[PDB]
Amino acid sequence: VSLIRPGAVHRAQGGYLILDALSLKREGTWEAFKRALRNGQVEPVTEPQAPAGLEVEPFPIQMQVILVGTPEAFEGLEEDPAFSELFRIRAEFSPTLPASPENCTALGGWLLAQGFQLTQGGLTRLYDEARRMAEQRDRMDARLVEIRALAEEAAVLGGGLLTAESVEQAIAAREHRSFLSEEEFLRAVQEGVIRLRTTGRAVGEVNSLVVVEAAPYWGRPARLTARAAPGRDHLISIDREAGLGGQIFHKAVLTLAGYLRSRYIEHGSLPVTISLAFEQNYVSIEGDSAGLAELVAALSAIGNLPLRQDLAVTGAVDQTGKVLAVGAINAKVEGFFRVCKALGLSGTQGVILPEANLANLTLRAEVLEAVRAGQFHIYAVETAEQALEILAGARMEGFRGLQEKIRAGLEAFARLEEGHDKEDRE
Amino acid sequence: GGQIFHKAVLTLAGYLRSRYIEHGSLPVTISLAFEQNYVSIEGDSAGLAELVAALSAIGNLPLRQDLAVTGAVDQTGKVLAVGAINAKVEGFFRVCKALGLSGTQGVILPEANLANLTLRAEVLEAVRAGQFHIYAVETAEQALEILAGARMEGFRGLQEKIRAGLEAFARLEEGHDKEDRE
């Protein structure tokens, strides 16, 4: 009798047992644990080498077991109908918390109880960095361990005290420790290895913004170019028909095709074929970013429109022409600003971003300082027409309009195609 | 041909289309091939070389064979940077020296790779002596201008020669379709 060892069930009698769903399912003990919970009784696990074994009475279960883990661990168990009635109560942890002065004070109190010494400015900067980490302006990040780690780094860089300078140094060091890839990209851009036009205007090309998959927190401009040729309506995205474009990118080409069709109908179809391709190969597409960038580049190629190359363009677009939000807008904006600063700010560089992402704009101190100084210009747009108007610097409607230029370009391409078919049936 | 090479043919097709539109399409088919089989392609090297060869074939343009051409190209016509530019330049210089330098051999390389040019002592000595000529280009037009030794624009231009070649090919194609519907 004295050899029965007490497990988690025995020690949690009359209280609460806390388990991890992913670890519970990893060991394969879910069935036996579920049966024990159903019966309310359980016996200690016995070795198969027992000749007769002890006649252990089942141990009554009077606890409240609580499973803690990521949801993905729970869609591995929620399909079981027996799991539903056992766990009638679902406690879901919000990925973000409301960015309010009460929440900032609560975070400061939590950090003080954690053992760190904070100042008002240090707490303010921690609150701001948590908001930026959540990617939303009015929602802080709920991952308290990440903020605790950043606070630890700030304490180390500041001798224990969490002043504003110390936390700023900690954030700068965290950015710089993974900055090697961006440093190499900036060196290549400066040396001319990767040529990006951040000054002047060019036709059929635009500085699309991408976020590297190897580290989905570093943005960098990608020189997308579009070329318009007469022919069939099919739109070519050369970087997709090589094994790189994803399923999400599949929707993008059809979306631009539908918008280009429905928006411009004075022939039965689009008399042009559009070839979309970035200059580089680090842009293996997974997602609907760029978007608006591809659309404005294709429209400029169709209408022979010199787009302002100093303004980067990002943001997904629909077949209606409305510009949709994209993730990691801060990373894209900061990357383009870094590239422009490497080549030197001319007081006109900027980023074309959707107005939907305006609630996600948590740009760093340097970018906001540049915007205040007038060296950088953040543009918010709703529809692709506004973005192309900003790029070309003129209105769509009216004479010398962008829409009439695109229509004239399409008409010229149709005339050349009909000349070709005229020579065909001669 | 590799996956990286797959987008290369589309890139040249797009550039050849968008750059030369006086018919509804390109009235020619271009057959790209190396004479040898040790060139199993993995990457976008050559590039500009393929483009200038195709353009010369279209326009009946005798390219200077003493100048090697390397470097990727985009559908805009800008010449892209490539890796191991030093190896390519040194190999071409070695081949030219084996057959004897005539004082005009050289390499057409993108200006983007100028920051990667770390040529050996012999190549730099030959360049200083004038026996070798390293050329740096930004767009395919410059490279083909160097190859053909004449300007794109103006009369007796390269662009007008390519346009005339495309026009002649279109005339022959429309003669074929004329005989077709007769």
Added chain:
Amino acid sequence: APAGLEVEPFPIQMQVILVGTPEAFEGLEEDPAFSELFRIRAEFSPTLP
């Protein structure tokens, strides 16, 4: 071991440092537990000025 010794767990007061090519690290960075253990990333530049 028939019964084995009742060894007390050894306290860990060390600072582990992992050295290797990145390709070895994309074999481990996906683990969420690896992130908070190794809060400091030391990346070696392939080139020097």
Added chain:
Amino acid sequence: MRLSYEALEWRTPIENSTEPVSLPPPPPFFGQERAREALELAIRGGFHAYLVGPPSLGKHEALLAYLSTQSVETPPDLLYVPLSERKVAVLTLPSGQE
């Protein structure tokens, strides 16, 4: 539209930063009233609950802190007693009597 700095400015301003802050510890599951209410209901009712959230958020630490401040009637002493050299049963005794 050309955004201005004021519309883009998001960092909360600081009027004094040279002094330490002294704030009381926050309640567990602060800013997460949904989960706190779920735990309150599961504790009052005795139901089995489960915590769901993004990884590396502090769910375990916050849950432990919240459960520490809880107060329940002292559990009875549960222990195995052998009815024989082969038969052993479960015995329930008042707390502290084992």
Added chain:
Amino acid sequence: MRLSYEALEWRTPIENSTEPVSLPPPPPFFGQERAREALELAIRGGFHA
């Protein structure tokens, strides 16, 4: 553009090569200040790097 030898010349010139060099040992992680700073932070803080 026809590059000249001066633009192509990249080897640093030598004005004297017949004498031995006597230089102090460089600091560890020389030319790699990113990694050196990462190690400094990980050592001061005791974090795992």
